[PDB]
Amino acid sequence: PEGVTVVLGAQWGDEGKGKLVDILAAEADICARCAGGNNAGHTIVVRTSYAFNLLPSGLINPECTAFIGSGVVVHVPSLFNELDTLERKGLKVAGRLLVSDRAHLVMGFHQIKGIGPAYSSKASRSGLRVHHLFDPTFPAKFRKLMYLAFAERLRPFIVDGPTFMHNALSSGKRVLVEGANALMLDLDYGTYPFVTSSSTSIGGVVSGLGISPFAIKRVVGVIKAYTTRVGGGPFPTEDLATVGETLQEVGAEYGGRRRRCGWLDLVVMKYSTMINGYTSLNLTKLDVLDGFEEIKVATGYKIDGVEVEGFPADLDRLAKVEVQYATLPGWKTDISNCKTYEEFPENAKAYIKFIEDYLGVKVQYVGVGPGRDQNVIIF
Amino acid sequence: PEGVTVVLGAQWGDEGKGKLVDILAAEADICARCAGGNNAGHTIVVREKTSYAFNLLPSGLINPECTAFIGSGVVVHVPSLFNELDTLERKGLKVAGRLLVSDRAHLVMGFHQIKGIGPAYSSKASRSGLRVHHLFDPTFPAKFRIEMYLAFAERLRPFIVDGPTFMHNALSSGKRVLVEGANALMLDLDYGTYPFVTSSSTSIGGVVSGLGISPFAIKRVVGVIKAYTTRVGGGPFPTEDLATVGETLQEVGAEYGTVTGRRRRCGWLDLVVMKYSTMINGYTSLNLTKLDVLDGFEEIKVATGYKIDGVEVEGFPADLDRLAKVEVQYATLPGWKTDISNCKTYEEFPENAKAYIKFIEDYLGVKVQYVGVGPGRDQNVIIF
């Protein structure tokens, strides 16, 4: 598919989008970050473990060019620390990495991790951008609150972002975008104030790459088969007993701190679908439910007996929600080695179909194990 | 077009997008602001003449059956909102009851203005900002660290909606939505002449984000391009004319600040800017405005390229020092030396006004659909 394929986290993050991106990166010329900081650290294992944080994980495909868009905020020392770690693990990066000269810089005083403060300076228009590193007045306006050494290593990566991307699109490149974090952590549309400091959604891709909405061809939402959260604020399907602990342990849901775990929440997913306009879904970690006799799925919110439309901006109202559940029979079998849709147990299919039918969006990829190879492509 | 039609300023603002909005609002069910603040002062005149100032509110309200929507991406100063609203109604234009505001829009507070748009977007990024739903939150006074905003809260209540749902329902039931971009592309927080830009997106991405919709829902994006270039702020301005061309554009185009009275910086049409602008926004067609301002020009220059040290510059430079050293390549086109203000079809245009339009079209590869040829409401030409 010529043009732009986008991969977005659909919930509150850690959905495990890495394997999909890796699958998709094999058919992509360019892999790009459009927004956010080095705040969505994640690892993928290949034949050897590769850590990606600021850099597009599509770099695992050797013929891919990686691109950092103008919407990103960049901590230069972390960038090179991350790059050097990858190359000293045998992955050639330097000849394939391009950085928009308009991306903003996370400074040392920003970490007094600094992503939020960097986006704050940006809004203030007192922030410094990548092109400032080659500006002879850089030291002066820095003092108004070593990089020069980094500027030299960075110099050959620098491009004019709008131009690079336009040329890519014009010459018919297939471009893959890796969304940072996830929808419910979006600055506008997430559980504010428990969100990140920038767009995590599809608009952030249009803004962050400076492209036409017309160039977006696919938007694949990554939906974990159950829900997790890291931060505070409400979490309607959270389980604080045995179910929560089983999800925690079987799903290896830790950063070292355990993640909050809960049933799948399709009220969240319906709102997420509304904002992002998913063309298909990646249902991940489905194997984590292999041992469950029964599986509940949130299908509705009520307050004082009346159906609640959409997702509430007010968190006290969100806290008062009474969750309506569907209960689905488990499959009680190891699906970790399924390789076609047809090998799925009947109740695993039913589970996928329930999600599809509820959301009106087809499920295209299914992650069924921790390994790179452990996926099912449905169409 | 069922779905979203967007109107975006293509240069550094003040292109005169009002007549276009007025034209499009007549065929729109909903008119929306998606991003920015009360920062784009603009007026519409109707018939024996009466002028309506729109700032925060969609000027699409000039069509009486149209519903106005303020998106989640907007930053809102509530007292200004009601000052503007009451003035429109006290001139006989009914607004209250056609106006809906996303409960996720952020609030411009008084201490932000010590206009406050920037500081409000700064609080948003810090996630310490207050949003519209907070006005109905009993902890509002606590985290403020007032009596007037609670009074405003009550007037505000029947306007408040869930933004994503309202827009989703609108698109589902086939409503025609018109989005009025604020300011212009070269003032975009990412892509403009930073730091001489506004504090948010003025471009097409800000629409997708600010209304919380799918890129697929965007049907048309009409760029408003003034027949010459103006600027208000500091920083470089490649086609700026500091002499007689500048003063003539300034005077004939009435290029004075809305409230400040301060003359705008004026220069030739710059298509290098427009090529870059097109690149970001992906215009489906163009609105060429104030073409009549060139009616008295014997020759008209148009920037077609930038060079630095004799070598052509691709795109637009992020570095302003590099922009400042740009040496501009101009084409020179013969004027038409005639009054085009009463033309009402393309065919009535003088041969050299047609040439000017075609030159713009051929250079940018985007067709010109509307041409403004005078200050009056009626004074425009629809080409197709």
mmCIF file of C-alpha atoms in Angstrom, chain B residues 150-383:
data_model
loop_
_atom_site.group_PDB
_atom_site.id
_atom_site.type_symbol
_atom_site.label_atom_id
_atom_site.label_comp_id
_atom_site.label_asym_id
_atom_site.label_seq_id
_atom_site.Cartn_x
_atom_site.Cartn_y
_atom_site.Cartn_z
ATOM 1 C CA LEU B 150 -18.820 30.390 38.239
ATOM 2 C CA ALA B 151 -21.315 32.993 37.022
ATOM 3 C CA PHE B 152 -20.018 32.353 33.496
ATOM 4 C CA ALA B 153 -20.291 28.599 34.134
ATOM 5 C CA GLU B 154 -24.085 28.889 34.255
ATOM 6 C CA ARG B 155 -24.376 30.805 30.984
ATOM 7 C CA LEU B 156 -21.995 28.244 29.553
ATOM 8 C CA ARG B 157 -23.838 25.127 30.702
ATOM 9 C CA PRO B 158 -26.420 24.699 27.921
ATOM 10 C CA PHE B 159 -23.620 25.062 25.324
ATOM 11 C CA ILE B 160 -21.402 22.264 26.694
ATOM 12 C CA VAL B 161 -21.194 18.989 24.774
ATOM 13 C CA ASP B 162 -18.952 15.988 24.495
ATOM 14 C CA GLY B 163 -16.856 17.055 21.476
ATOM 15 C CA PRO B 164 -15.916 13.663 19.991
ATOM 16 C CA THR B 165 -19.525 12.391 20.204
ATOM 17 C CA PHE B 166 -21.101 15.524 18.776
ATOM 18 C CA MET B 167 -18.779 15.459 15.755
ATOM 19 C CA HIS B 168 -19.044 11.682 15.285
ATOM 20 C CA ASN B 169 -22.865 11.957 15.307
ATOM 21 C CA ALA B 170 -22.708 14.883 12.907
ATOM 22 C CA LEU B 171 -20.596 12.926 10.398
ATOM 23 C CA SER B 172 -22.763 9.747 10.857
ATOM 24 C CA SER B 173 -26.032 11.554 10.123
ATOM 25 C CA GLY B 174 -24.418 13.147 7.059
ATOM 26 C CA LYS B 175 -24.016 16.737 8.284
ATOM 27 C CA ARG B 176 -21.918 19.117 6.198
ATOM 28 C CA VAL B 177 -19.173 20.470 8.423
ATOM 29 C CA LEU B 178 -17.172 23.593 7.671
ATOM 30 C CA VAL B 179 -13.985 24.171 9.595
ATOM 31 C CA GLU B 180 -12.508 27.720 9.754
ATOM 32 C CA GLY B 181 -8.764 27.485 10.317
ATOM 33 C CA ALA B 182 -7.361 30.263 12.502
ATOM 34 C CA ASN B 183 -4.469 32.439 11.286
ATOM 35 C CA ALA B 184 -2.346 30.729 8.627
ATOM 36 C CA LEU B 185 0.220 28.127 7.575
ATOM 37 C CA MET B 186 3.337 30.317 7.953
ATOM 38 C CA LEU B 187 2.190 31.029 11.521
ATOM 39 C CA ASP B 188 1.917 27.260 12.360
ATOM 40 C CA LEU B 189 3.664 26.243 15.628
ATOM 41 C CA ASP B 190 5.642 23.501 13.848
ATOM 42 C CA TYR B 191 6.009 24.660 10.294
ATOM 43 C CA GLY B 192 5.923 28.451 10.366
ATOM 44 C CA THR B 193 8.671 31.010 10.769
ATOM 45 C CA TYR B 194 9.400 29.818 14.351
ATOM 46 C CA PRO B 195 9.659 31.436 16.820
ATOM 47 C CA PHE B 196 7.573 34.071 14.961
ATOM 48 C CA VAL B 197 4.463 31.874 14.900
ATOM 49 C CA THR B 198 1.348 31.216 17.005
ATOM 50 C CA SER B 199 1.423 28.702 19.833
ATOM 51 C CA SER B 200 -0.546 25.921 18.141
ATOM 52 C CA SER B 201 -1.317 24.233 14.828
ATOM 53 C CA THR B 202 -2.877 26.426 12.162
ATOM 54 C CA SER B 203 -2.624 23.659 9.591
ATOM 55 C CA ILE B 204 -4.600 20.663 8.499
ATOM 56 C CA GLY B 205 -3.289 18.392 11.292
ATOM 57 C CA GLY B 206 -4.725 20.786 13.848
ATOM 58 C CA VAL B 207 -8.139 20.118 12.307
ATOM 59 C CA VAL B 208 -7.915 16.336 12.638
ATOM 60 C CA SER B 209 -6.602 16.709 16.203
ATOM 61 C CA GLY B 210 -8.762 19.616 17.301
ATOM 62 C CA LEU B 211 -12.072 18.035 16.263
ATOM 63 C CA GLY B 212 -10.953 14.506 17.162
ATOM 64 C CA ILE B 213 -11.897 13.048 13.782
ATOM 65 C CA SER B 214 -10.429 10.674 11.195
ATOM 66 C CA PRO B 215 -8.154 12.007 8.422
ATOM 67 C CA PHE B 216 -10.564 10.093 6.154
ATOM 68 C CA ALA B 217 -13.372 12.458 7.125
ATOM 69 C CA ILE B 218 -11.638 15.422 5.427
ATOM 70 C CA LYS B 219 -13.186 16.059 1.995
ATOM 71 C CA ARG B 220 -11.920 19.495 0.827
ATOM 72 C CA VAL B 221 -9.102 21.750 1.936
ATOM 73 C CA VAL B 222 -9.332 25.204 0.351
ATOM 74 C CA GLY B 223 -6.248 27.397 0.760
ATOM 75 C CA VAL B 224 -6.768 31.136 0.985
ATOM 76 C CA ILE B 225 -3.937 32.868 -0.886
ATOM 77 C CA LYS B 226 -3.741 36.661 -1.038
ATOM 78 C CA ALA B 227 -2.628 38.060 -4.438
ATOM 79 C CA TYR B 228 0.347 39.576 -2.573
ATOM 80 C CA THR B 229 2.038 38.806 0.756
ATOM 81 C CA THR B 230 1.641 40.534 4.137
ATOM 82 C CA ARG B 231 3.234 40.050 7.533
ATOM 83 C CA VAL B 232 2.491 41.404 10.988
ATOM 84 C CA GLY B 233 5.282 40.051 13.189
ATOM 85 C CA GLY B 234 9.065 40.227 13.191
ATOM 86 C CA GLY B 235 11.513 37.814 11.582
ATOM 87 C CA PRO B 236 12.485 37.584 7.898
ATOM 88 C CA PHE B 237 10.109 38.306 5.026
ATOM 89 C CA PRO B 238 11.785 37.510 1.638
ATOM 90 C CA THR B 239 9.470 39.412 -0.705
ATOM 91 C CA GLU B 240 9.011 42.372 1.648
ATOM 92 C CA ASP B 241 9.145 45.754 -0.065
ATOM 93 C CA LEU B 242 10.348 48.642 2.072
ATOM 94 C CA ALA B 243 9.575 51.272 -0.568
ATOM 95 C CA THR B 244 6.806 52.298 -2.968
ATOM 96 C CA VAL B 245 5.525 48.865 -3.942
ATOM 97 C CA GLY B 246 5.165 48.166 -0.217
ATOM 98 C CA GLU B 247 3.361 51.420 0.489
ATOM 99 C CA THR B 248 1.012 51.033 -2.479
ATOM 100 C CA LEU B 249 0.001 47.445 -1.500
ATOM 101 C CA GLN B 250 -0.383 48.713 2.048
ATOM 102 C CA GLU B 251 -2.607 51.637 1.085
ATOM 103 C CA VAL B 252 -4.698 50.083 -1.742
ATOM 104 C CA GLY B 253 -5.180 46.855 0.246
ATOM 105 C CA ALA B 254 -6.022 48.764 3.454
ATOM 106 C CA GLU B 255 -3.484 46.631 5.290
ATOM 107 C CA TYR B 256 -3.878 48.022 8.814
ATOM 108 C CA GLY B 257 -4.121 46.143 12.098
ATOM 109 C CA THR B 258 -7.664 45.394 13.203
ATOM 110 C CA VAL B 259 -7.465 47.145 16.568
ATOM 111 C CA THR B 260 -3.874 48.385 16.657
ATOM 112 C CA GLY B 261 -4.096 50.644 13.572
ATOM 113 C CA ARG B 262 -0.554 49.551 12.756
ATOM 114 C CA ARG B 263 0.268 49.102 9.071
ATOM 115 C CA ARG B 264 1.122 45.548 7.985
ATOM 116 C CA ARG B 265 4.416 44.668 6.306
ATOM 117 C CA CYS B 266 3.768 44.173 2.586
ATOM 118 C CA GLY B 267 5.565 42.373 -0.215
ATOM 119 C CA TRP B 268 5.141 40.625 -3.563
ATOM 120 C CA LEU B 269 3.355 37.280 -3.963
ATOM 121 C CA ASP B 270 5.739 34.552 -2.865
ATOM 122 C CA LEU B 271 5.036 31.168 -4.474
ATOM 123 C CA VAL B 272 8.019 29.500 -2.806
ATOM 124 C CA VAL B 273 6.041 30.078 0.395
ATOM 125 C CA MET B 274 2.908 28.844 -1.347
ATOM 126 C CA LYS B 275 4.624 25.671 -2.599
ATOM 127 C CA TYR B 276 5.735 24.863 0.957
ATOM 128 C CA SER B 277 2.286 25.765 2.305
ATOM 129 C CA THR B 278 0.634 23.426 -0.221
ATOM 130 C CA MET B 279 3.053 20.726 0.772
ATOM 131 C CA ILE B 280 1.898 20.852 4.431
ATOM 132 C CA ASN B 281 -1.831 21.346 3.864
ATOM 133 C CA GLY B 282 -2.571 19.521 0.597
ATOM 134 C CA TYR B 283 -5.017 22.104 -0.786
ATOM 135 C CA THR B 284 -7.720 20.677 -3.026
ATOM 136 C CA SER B 285 -8.302 24.176 -4.474
ATOM 137 C CA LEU B 286 -7.394 27.843 -3.876
ATOM 138 C CA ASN B 287 -9.108 31.111 -2.985
ATOM 139 C CA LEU B 288 -7.095 33.999 -4.511
ATOM 140 C CA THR B 289 -7.995 37.166 -2.632
ATOM 141 C CA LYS B 290 -7.623 40.940 -3.079
ATOM 142 C CA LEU B 291 -6.613 40.601 -6.737
ATOM 143 C CA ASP B 292 -8.011 44.088 -7.307
ATOM 144 C CA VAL B 293 -5.206 45.545 -5.163
ATOM 145 C CA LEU B 294 -2.927 44.952 -8.196
ATOM 146 C CA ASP B 295 -5.269 46.682 -10.680
ATOM 147 C CA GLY B 296 -3.036 49.796 -10.815
ATOM 148 C CA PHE B 297 0.307 47.981 -11.272
ATOM 149 C CA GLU B 298 2.124 48.286 -14.586
ATOM 150 C CA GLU B 299 4.348 45.317 -13.701
ATOM 151 C CA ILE B 300 3.899 42.635 -11.010
ATOM 152 C CA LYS B 301 6.693 40.519 -9.622
ATOM 153 C CA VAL B 302 6.160 37.012 -8.221
ATOM 154 C CA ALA B 303 8.771 35.023 -6.280
ATOM 155 C CA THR B 304 9.420 31.660 -7.935
ATOM 156 C CA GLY B 305 12.658 30.535 -6.282
ATOM 157 C CA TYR B 306 15.154 31.025 -3.458
ATOM 158 C CA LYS B 307 18.938 30.897 -3.846
ATOM 159 C CA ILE B 308 21.607 31.273 -1.148
ATOM 160 C CA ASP B 309 25.134 31.179 -2.586
ATOM 161 C CA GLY B 310 24.010 30.864 -6.178
ATOM 162 C CA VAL B 311 22.443 27.473 -5.521
ATOM 163 C CA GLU B 312 18.666 26.844 -5.493
ATOM 164 C CA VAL B 313 17.061 26.150 -2.098
ATOM 165 C CA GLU B 314 14.507 23.341 -1.987
ATOM 166 C CA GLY B 315 11.427 23.903 0.188
ATOM 167 C CA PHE B 316 11.388 26.446 3.015
ATOM 168 C CA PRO B 317 14.265 26.938 5.516
ATOM 169 C CA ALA B 318 13.747 26.204 9.214
ATOM 170 C CA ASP B 319 16.775 28.367 10.070
ATOM 171 C CA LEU B 320 15.833 32.073 9.983
ATOM 172 C CA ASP B 321 19.411 33.311 9.511
ATOM 173 C CA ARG B 322 19.490 31.216 6.361
ATOM 174 C CA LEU B 323 16.063 32.636 5.405
ATOM 175 C CA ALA B 324 17.426 36.166 5.964
ATOM 176 C CA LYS B 325 20.240 35.596 3.467
ATOM 177 C CA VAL B 326 17.868 34.230 0.822
ATOM 178 C CA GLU B 327 18.228 35.982 -2.545
ATOM 179 C CA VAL B 328 14.849 35.930 -4.275
ATOM 180 C CA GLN B 329 14.254 34.839 -7.889
ATOM 181 C CA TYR B 330 11.351 36.738 -9.433
ATOM 182 C CA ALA B 331 9.214 36.366 -12.509
ATOM 183 C CA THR B 332 7.804 39.639 -13.823
ATOM 184 C CA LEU B 333 4.255 39.664 -15.256
ATOM 185 C CA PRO B 334 2.588 42.479 -17.172
ATOM 186 C CA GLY B 335 -0.217 44.235 -15.271
ATOM 187 C CA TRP B 336 -3.764 44.616 -16.595
ATOM 188 C CA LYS B 337 -4.132 48.244 -15.520
ATOM 189 C CA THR B 338 -7.892 48.039 -15.230
ATOM 190 C CA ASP B 339 -10.649 47.827 -12.598
ATOM 191 C CA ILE B 340 -11.579 44.190 -11.995
ATOM 192 C CA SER B 341 -13.805 44.928 -8.985
ATOM 193 C CA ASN B 342 -17.067 44.385 -10.915
ATOM 194 C CA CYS B 343 -16.159 41.180 -12.709
ATOM 195 C CA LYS B 344 -18.532 38.329 -11.822
ATOM 196 C CA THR B 345 -17.286 35.556 -14.112
ATOM 197 C CA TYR B 346 -13.805 34.308 -15.024
ATOM 198 C CA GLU B 347 -14.344 35.316 -18.655
ATOM 199 C CA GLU B 348 -14.807 39.003 -17.776
ATOM 200 C CA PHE B 349 -11.261 39.080 -16.361
ATOM 201 C CA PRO B 350 -8.658 41.079 -18.368
ATOM 202 C CA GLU B 351 -6.247 38.851 -20.298
ATOM 203 C CA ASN B 352 -3.394 39.582 -17.909
ATOM 204 C CA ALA B 353 -5.443 38.868 -14.744
ATOM 205 C CA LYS B 354 -6.238 35.471 -16.302
ATOM 206 C CA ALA B 355 -2.498 35.080 -16.954
ATOM 207 C CA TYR B 356 -1.744 35.887 -13.315
ATOM 208 C CA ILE B 357 -4.228 33.281 -12.095
ATOM 209 C CA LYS B 358 -3.008 30.686 -14.552
ATOM 210 C CA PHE B 359 0.619 31.366 -13.550
ATOM 211 C CA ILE B 360 -0.257 30.692 -9.912
ATOM 212 C CA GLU B 361 -2.227 27.541 -10.848
ATOM 213 C CA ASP B 362 0.467 26.130 -13.133
ATOM 214 C CA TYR B 363 3.243 26.828 -10.623
ATOM 215 C CA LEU B 364 1.518 25.277 -7.583
ATOM 216 C CA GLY B 365 -0.367 22.569 -9.487
ATOM 217 C CA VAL B 366 -3.556 23.470 -7.657
ATOM 218 C CA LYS B 367 -6.520 25.099 -9.427
ATOM 219 C CA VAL B 368 -7.895 28.468 -8.341
ATOM 220 C CA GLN B 369 -11.600 28.134 -7.577
ATOM 221 C CA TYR B 370 -12.542 31.483 -5.999
ATOM 222 C CA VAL B 371 -11.188 35.005 -6.688
ATOM 223 C CA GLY B 372 -11.895 37.996 -4.413
ATOM 224 C CA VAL B 373 -11.974 41.232 -6.457
ATOM 225 C CA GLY B 374 -13.268 43.802 -3.980
ATOM 226 C CA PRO B 375 -14.080 44.599 -0.327
ATOM 227 C CA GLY B 376 -17.805 43.970 -0.782
ATOM 228 C CA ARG B 377 -19.570 40.696 0.050
ATOM 229 C CA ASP B 378 -20.754 40.247 -3.535
ATOM 230 C CA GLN B 379 -17.345 40.952 -5.070
ATOM 231 C CA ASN B 380 -15.931 37.507 -5.870
ATOM 232 C CA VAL B 381 -15.760 35.108 -8.791
ATOM 233 C CA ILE B 382 -16.456 31.390 -8.584
ATOM 234 C CA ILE B 383 -14.472 29.652 -11.329
#
